[PDB]
Point group: C2
Chain length 620, copies 2
């Protein structure tokens, strides 16, 4: 019944039949993206119209199309041919990955480079990686992948332990031509294995860990209705899933007494870029846009009870489409549970003799994805006190290279002859704000130091200042940890009982932003990553910080072009885009499989409530 329900297998099958009958899904077509569209802005929108947006690829070389379908009326709403040399290529297809290694295996330059290094071609795995846009004019308008080679000594071997440095190949996966094979010189292939389930490497397994039993004897405190609507501890929201973005949170609201108060209309991680900082021509082109180029939702793991998710777990199994329009279920792809979160508030008062302690809890919504060697966990948290928090967890296997004799300023050594180039993992959170409604504004809050003198005779005073961001041209902001800079999203028309506008405060981790030179290709295509905070006026077609078609787009798409419109954002329908990330200089302890490292952000109420919202939590 809800317009925000998860897509069903039936809806996807109905989309496939509609496209096929319209002549848009023949043998030479592939679906590169399929997803449901959000309802348009309308507080009276009640007529059910489930629409899907589809990117259709053509393997014979015809121009691709963007199609919008109504599953409701069974009609094609629009269909436009795309000029990819202008607006960018479609996302990478899972079936194009295997093609790279197959084509190189019969290419004579590739075989000769392998022969010089005495490598069996049957043992050489190729990582197929996105191409980017650099100085090669012949790749414009063509779908290119670039390949790096790794040796797999046997079928169960971890190939990441054995990079083949000095070698890279470019492949046109449409015409199936190897365009270039570049051999910069022979490097020894590192010999130690990295097999983290080999008893030879692990040693005897620990027998010292005792079980921790987390049970909910009366079931969980949250309810799920209509498939994906959660109610928990005065929170209300809908859990969506998109094949590009992954888990998406809709309609986050909080019941304050007898009022359901909106906070966030839509929350998602709308891009994620992994730029490498090794100047070697073998890797200086390497930049993953995991969300925009690869689609992180389509690689979500099925999550195992007790291993991946511990406690009383409620699962969602979302449906996506395969490349032919068949529905595919990601069984146990989203975990939902609550967990204890320690002390919430505590005071023992000498004067009143009252001793008071209450415990905190958080609601957790999570999924995990695997893109090649990397694995990323996406965690959304809701706390009793109104805090909302996101956390990314990075693990998997680091990407490797040779470690050069004489060292490197841009690569860490992990094992004899084995290196790991420096890189970053940078996320963009898109937060379509709705603090008590859609009339919102953003203020930047800095700490203000004061000088000893008149009115500050003892030199103890300090203060704070707030600056309203009024237009998009002034709403590109950077962090300043030294002055405790935060950002407040308020509703100037909804006041608390002290007649102050209600608000929420964004707390960033203040990690470094994109380190690449400003003139570089990655700084142009990942412009969002150069600044900590962006604010735009809402528009329904401004969805991703990097534009709709990220793969092999020349740059400038997404946020820099949106911001150029210089729209009013002072008491308007606005969207907050927060950049945050990890700068990873790999350490020996990250090898051969990396312990989790985390980064995130959180939002806390700032005069949104008239007093603490957890006074009604029982002692238990």
């Amino acid at each position: 019944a809800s317009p925000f329900r998860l897509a069903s297998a039936g809806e996807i099958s109905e989309v496939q039949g509609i496209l096929r009958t319209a002549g848009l899904l023949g043998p030479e077509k592939r679906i590169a993206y399929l997803g449901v569209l959000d309802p348009a802005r309308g507080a009276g929108s009640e007529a059910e119209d489930r629409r899907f947006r589809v990117f259709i690829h053509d393997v014979s070389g015809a121009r691709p199309q963007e199609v919008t379908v109504s599953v409701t009326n069974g009609t094609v709403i629009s269909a436009v041919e795309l000029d990819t040399a202008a607006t960018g290529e479609l996302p990478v297809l899972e079936e194009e990955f295997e093609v790279v290694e197959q084509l190189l295996a019969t290419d004579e330059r590739w075989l000769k480079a392998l022969a010089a290094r005495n490598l069996d071609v049957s043992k050489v795995r190729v990582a197929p990686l996105s191409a980017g846009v650099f100085e090669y004019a012949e790749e414009r308008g063509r779908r290119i992948l670039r390949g790096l080679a790794f040796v797999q000594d046997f079928p169960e071997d971890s190939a990441w332990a054995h990079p083949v440095d000095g070698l890279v190949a470019y492949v046109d996966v449409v015409s199936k031509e190897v365009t270039r094979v570049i051999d910069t010189g022979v490097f020894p292939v590192p010999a130690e294995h990295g097999n983290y389930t080999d008893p030879e490497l692990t040693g005897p397994l620990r027998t010292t860990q005792k079980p921790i039993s987390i049970t909910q004897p009366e079931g969980p405190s949250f309810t799920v209705t209509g498939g994906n609507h959660i109610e928990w501890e005065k929170w209300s929201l809908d859990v969506g899933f998109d094949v590009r973005e992954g888990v998406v949170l809709h309609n986050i609201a909080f019941r304050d007494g007898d009022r359901l108060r909106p906070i966030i209309n839509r929350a998602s991680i709308a891009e994620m870029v992994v730029p490498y900082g090794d100047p070697s021509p073998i890797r200086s082109w390497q930049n993953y846009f995991d969300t925009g180029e690869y689609l992180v939702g389509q690689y979500a793991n099925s999550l195992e009870l007790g291993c991946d998710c511990l406690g009383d777990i409620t699962y969602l199994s979302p449906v996506i489409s395969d490349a032919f329009g068949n529905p595919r279920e990601i069984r146990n792809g989203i975990c939902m549970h609550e967990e204890d979160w320690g002390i919430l508030a505590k005071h023992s008062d000498l004067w009143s003799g009252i001793n008071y302690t209450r415990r905190n809890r958080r609601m957790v919504i999570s999924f995990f994805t695997t893109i090649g060697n990397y694995d990323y966990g996406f965690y959304w948290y809701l706390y009793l006190d109104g805090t909302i928090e996101f956390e990314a967890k990075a693990t998997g296997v680091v990407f490797t290279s040779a470690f050069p004799e004489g060292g490197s300023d841009n690569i860490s050594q992990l094992a004899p002859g084995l290196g790991a180039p420096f890189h970053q993992h940078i996320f963009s959170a898109r937060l379509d704000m709705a603090i008590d409604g859609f009339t919102n504004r953003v203020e930047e809050e800095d700490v203000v130091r004061q000088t000893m003198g008149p009115g500050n005779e003892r030199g103890n005073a300090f203060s704070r200042k707030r600056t309203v961001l009024t237009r998009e041209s002034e709403a590109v902001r950077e962090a300043d940890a030294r002055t405790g800079r935060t950002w407040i999203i308020s509703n100037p028309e909804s006041k608390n009982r002290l007649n102050e506008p209600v608000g929420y405060k964004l707390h960033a981790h203040n990690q470094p932003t994109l380190l690449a030179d400003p003139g570089s290709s990655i700084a142009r295509r990942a412009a969002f990553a150069t600044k900590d905070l962006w604010v735009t006026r809402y528009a329904d077609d401004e969805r991703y910080p990097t534009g709709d078609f990220v793969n092999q787009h020349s740059g400038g798409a997404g946020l820099p072009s949106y911001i150029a419109q210089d729209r009013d954002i002072d008491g308007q329908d606005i969207v907050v885009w927060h950049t945050f990330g990890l700068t990873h200089f790999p350490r020996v302890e990250d090898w051969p499989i990396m312990p989790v490292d985390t980064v995130g952000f959180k939002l806390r109420p700032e005069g949104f409530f008239d007093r603490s919202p957890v006074l009604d939590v029982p002692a238990n």
Copy 2:
């Protein structure tokens, strides 16, 4: 047996007996501090000689004494008379707090001030606060407390809801004389109650929270031997307790195969300061040195099972001395338990076909203290992967004032007429490092951005730089979040298998440091708080960043005096002092009782191990 065992009741009783026999603890004497001394540097030393340090106050006004005794030999080792006008007053005694309200209730100036406000003296509570050093010459060499008043409407009322602004009194607690009563004018006393257990303010309690049960059917995975020696998942340490610093960690080591490897010799929170930034003369003197002036261990709570500490809890009950030398047990004052901590490492490999998931856990050592309106939790965490983390949790009731008509730049409004002055909560971590032994050094690590051009033709490279701190004069460092700055403590004489010095990396939160003007009294007394990192050469008498006697002591002791020795710290026995804090602009949601906010730091291995140290964790 172990020289780091907790002080026993018998030892404290013996100190009492020894001081009495020596004529140092007659009826007019009071114990203001009593603590066990750590063994001096020496592998062998005195078989065991348990020594105790005592500060002895005299209630007839005679000069106090610092005394060291050996409980083993039954002897006084040294006893020195203190000139408190020069070196500082002793910490505040618990029995002195009660003096203040009782003395004011008979003072004609105080009664006249309350009569002017139509207040009944029998309902006026006085918060007795540390005095600091300002422009009052008659206070030099006297023990002074300052009092701020709050109305309690009935015996169970929260007095913090009803501050009596415009009024402050100064009291000599030894001669029992009210030195000054200052009245800057009548403010309305805020009328709303702040009683967070009153059903009329909480409303009906929630019935929606279902139980979370956390059990360990085979018991915990750690062992406790010798009363306070912990072994847990390759970690080894001794948990100490001191009445000034609270929980102290000794001898933190990690068993790496055959070898027990030292990491940290002694870890403590060695000072904490809470400065207020309201320039009103009623409060511009307000700064708490909770550790140095009040002794935070003295006010440790007894922690309730299932409420304060949830799960399979092992308790320690430390023993301290009262003001007369009798042992007092802080029952269930320390909780110790292990917690599940989500995913440790995870990878699904396409090429090998192996799926791999491991879970993380942490060991938690915690205590809570209550000082007036404030409650602080101190948590130390040890993780499976070698990470060490500290977290402070701040809750309780915010300190209040009137909210002036027309507003304030230095005070938040919480309720009609009720204000909360801006303030900070700043901690100093003293980390006596011992990375694989005592030969250590600190490097400051910054990210290095690189310009596009020769050798970096695509503008993607970035790097890092490390700067060795070689002398104490250059070891006073500030954060730089923009350049990702961290600090590495390494042992230049212990190399990993890649022939690199083993190390640990300090990750700060990069919160603002002390905001007060550099010429202010608080900036001089809390000089440690103005910089993020200090490194000193180890010395037995350099224990606290503010010095031994903080109460009513001007600047001239502590970290700035230590650093002036300019000693060699490059490959020596060194101590890291890390400043970190919260800057608190109170919000409406902090009233009437504050939900927990947090700050901390962590240390992670950086080439300390030869590979990941958690390959031998089993799959459950």
